[PDB]
Design a protein around this ligand. Structure first.
Ligand SMILES: NC(=O)c1ccc[n+]([C@@H]2O[C@H](COP(=O)([O-])OP(=O)([O-])OC[C@H]3O[C@@H](n4cnc5c(N)[nH+]cnc54)[C@H](O)[C@@H]3O)[C@@H](O)[C@H]2O)c1
Ligand SMILES: NC(=O)c1ccc[n+]([C@@H]2O[C@H](COP(=O)([O-])OP(=O)([O-])OC[C@H]3O[C@@H](n4cnc5c(N)[nH+]cnc54)[C@H](O)[C@@H]3O)[C@@H](O)[C@H]2O)c1
Ligand SMILES: [Zn+2]
Ligand SMILES: [Zn+2]
Ligand SMILES: [Zn+2]
Ligand SMILES: [Zn+2]
Lengths: 374, 374
């Protein structure tokens, strides 16, 4: 009943940095060629969405944020072949165009069509599908999931199992896949190894899940909020340390605890200092450190390259290294077969209209993931 | 006969930084338990030896430098099982104790018994075998090859083929193995890939040799000294670029030349700026950059961690990642079997007494490797 028509619906519009979202009516244009309009069902609150608010992650404003979500296709534009109306879908904040040199590379996943490296806040065609108060509103990472309806490019959506529980599998759209893949795919954690995970939010807990799935013998969680430790141990941490408890820098503490450095470390916070600490704490000759946290816009870290010359490997990744469109449906299928759990990440459920309370819960340190229901 | 006796011989002593080597008589003590005294036959001039002179690489002075060499065992201390008097040997500036967690790790080679991290300038037992004018003289990297005789710990020497030409295979003691391994073992260059090699000295040429051996389709040499380009092309570079010739930064040039970034880059100079440029020029999603150049003492680089978050891998290595004592004899056997060439690295052959002339050739940009012959 809405195909080819503008939809008026509620969205969470961010007009200004460091302000609450405004829940108000927007106009969502119908999909153009190779575009898909989605009725959203559930969306998670990822710290990266908060980074938009705080100006940590710069993207044009005003904007409809949200990138961790699931919904049901309302309509498809001309030439769409990979989804149909009524399909369950997860928007892909990292696209998979299938054509660029990264998509063709066996390891690569950061498709050249992404809107993360130099955000423009548009559809692929450089325009917006959103109007609010007669004003155009930017997209975010091609997804804009904080809206009852969004429009995405076909390369930014994956069809998932029709029997999927959308209020759970929305986490496959960012935090779970990112953390789990950072361990299993990017780091390639080995059986019997020692891991250190800096930051025990939804993404860091997913890193722990992946380290445990990979057979790590020791998984040391690191957080300045000791309230995070109990859940980290539930999902596989063997021990947790709070840097604030120690006189010495935590890289020295972790090096001593691991009898000369860890096999794999993960920065899952977004601070320059913890990126360098996490590198330093991995064993100097054969250690691997993976950056997962989003750094503050345009800021450089300082480090001694002798940390690398001795043999360390330093890498980072978006979305756990997963080729998004190939991987998301498989991750959903694995979830349905109980190959991993998502409930440990979900601490709070709210209606979409309580989005600002959901961000309050994240900022206070209380929540891991709040799932918003439309 | 010399066994069990002090040897008086000629060595090149560096009494203080930024001075010529002093060629004079030293006393070399006999080897203690698990030590080996070696009559030197040939030693190369590596830029790392010059770093000791320039204060780029800090190690205790006064010192007998030299780490790239080959010679013949004169005598063995009690308990030595791996070499005998008369054997051809290469000193190992990276030891292989076989017992530490690094030596037992499949991918580690920076043995914890090394004297590079935190240089003491002694034997393993914390003492020196060298005196000169009644003063103790430090060792360098457990090797000290700028001497007619040296004493090394057993874990710092490898036996090699008795028919080895020592005036060539001394390069397996540092520059060839470092560069070649950095390509084939550390980076794991792939067939059909595009490589960029920053610095076309003896080590960078050995990186090119490894990239060509691994089947790279394109190998871009980068040097500010265009006199280095002809030999780079002879050993496999498909093209060479001088950053001084361009208005743009060379990372932008190399990204354009490679249609979006190279597969593998190598820093083979020792400058913070070229370490960051080399990382930046590899493809942002799947590129790999290897640091080979020794950085200036205690200086930190500045970089944006978004370079890693998109998917790049950044690593470094000592001695090409080779486990030294296992690898050196095999590299010499491979050379004897014509699997690689060393003559392209050798531009000058001088008597040992002309060490300062050999360093002046390196500093002027006029040599690759000078081999000093005893
Ligand atoms: N690379 C990707 O594709 C990707 C995906 C998803 C999230 N992210 C980023 O990953 C980071 C974590 O996201 P999240 O799990 O949703 O966030 P979160 O829930 O805010 O978790 C971060 C955790 O870090 C802890 N912390 C803060 N400061 C320190 C410190 N100094 N030392 C140790 N712990 C500290 C903090 O207490 C919290 O539990 C954020 O920067 C996100 O933007 C990146
Ligand atoms: N990691 C290891 O185990 C290891 C082993 C051997 C050597 N090294 C280091 O590797 C580096 C190279 O050694 P080498 O080949 O003997 O030295 P080298 O022969 O002096 O070669 C260095 C090359 O870099 C070139 N160069 C200088 N500045 C620039 C610049 N700004 N941009 C481009 N090219 C430039 C220079 O012209 C020369 O051809 C040195 O820092 C050594 O200390 C490290
Ligand atoms: Zn693509
Ligand atoms: Zn996210
Ligand atoms: Zn060892
Ligand atoms: Zn060297």
């Amino acid at each position: 009943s809405t195909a080819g028509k503008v939809i008026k619906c509620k969205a969470a519009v961010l007009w200004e940095e460091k302000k609450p979202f405004s829940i108000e009516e927007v106009e969502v244009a119908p999909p153009k060629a190779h575009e898909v309009r989605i009725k959203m069902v559930a969306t998670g609150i990822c710290r990266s969405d908060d980074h938009v608010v705080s100006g940590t992650l710069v993207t044009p404003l005003p904007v409809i944020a949200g990138h961790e979500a699931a919904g049901i296709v309302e309509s498809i534009g001309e030439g769409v072949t990979t989804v149909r109306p009524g399909d369950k879908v997860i928007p892909l904040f990292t696209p998979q165009c299938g054509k660029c040199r990264v998509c063709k590379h066996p390891e690569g996943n950061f498709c050249l069509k992404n809107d993360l490296s130099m955000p423009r806040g548009t559809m692929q065609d450089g325009t917006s599908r959103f109007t609010c108060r007669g004003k155009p509103i930017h997209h975010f990472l091609g997804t804009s999931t904080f809206s009852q309806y969004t429009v995405v490019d076909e390369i930014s959506v994956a069809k998932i199992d029709a029997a999927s529980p959308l209020e759970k599998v929305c986490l496959i759209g960012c935090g779970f896949s990112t953390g789990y893949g950072s361990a299993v795919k990017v780091a390639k954690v080995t059986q019997g190894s020692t891991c250190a995970v800096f930051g025990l939010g939804g993404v860091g807990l997913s890193v722990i899940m992946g380290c445990k799935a990979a057979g790590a013998a020791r998984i040391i969680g690191v957080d300045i909020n000791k309230d995070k430790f109990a859940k980290a141990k539930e999902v596989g941490a063997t021990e947790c340390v709070n840097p604030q408890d120690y006189k010495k820098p935590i890289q020295e503490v972790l090096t001593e605890m691991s009898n000369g450095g860890v096999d794999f470390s993960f920065e899952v916070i977004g601070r320059l200092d913890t990126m360098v600490t996490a590198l330093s704490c991995c064993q100097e000759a054969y250690g691997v450190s993976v950056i997962v946290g989003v750094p503050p816009d345009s800021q450089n870290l300082s480090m001694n390259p002798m940390l690398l010359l001795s043999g360390r490997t330093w890498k980072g990744a978006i979305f756990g290294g997963f080729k998004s469109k190939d991987s998301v449906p498989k991750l959903v299928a694995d979830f349905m077969a109980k190959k991993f759990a998502l409930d440990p990440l979900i601490t709070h459920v709210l209606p979409f209209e309580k989005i600002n309370e959901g961000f309050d819960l994240l900022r206070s340190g209380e929540s891991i993931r709040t799932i918003l229901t439309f």
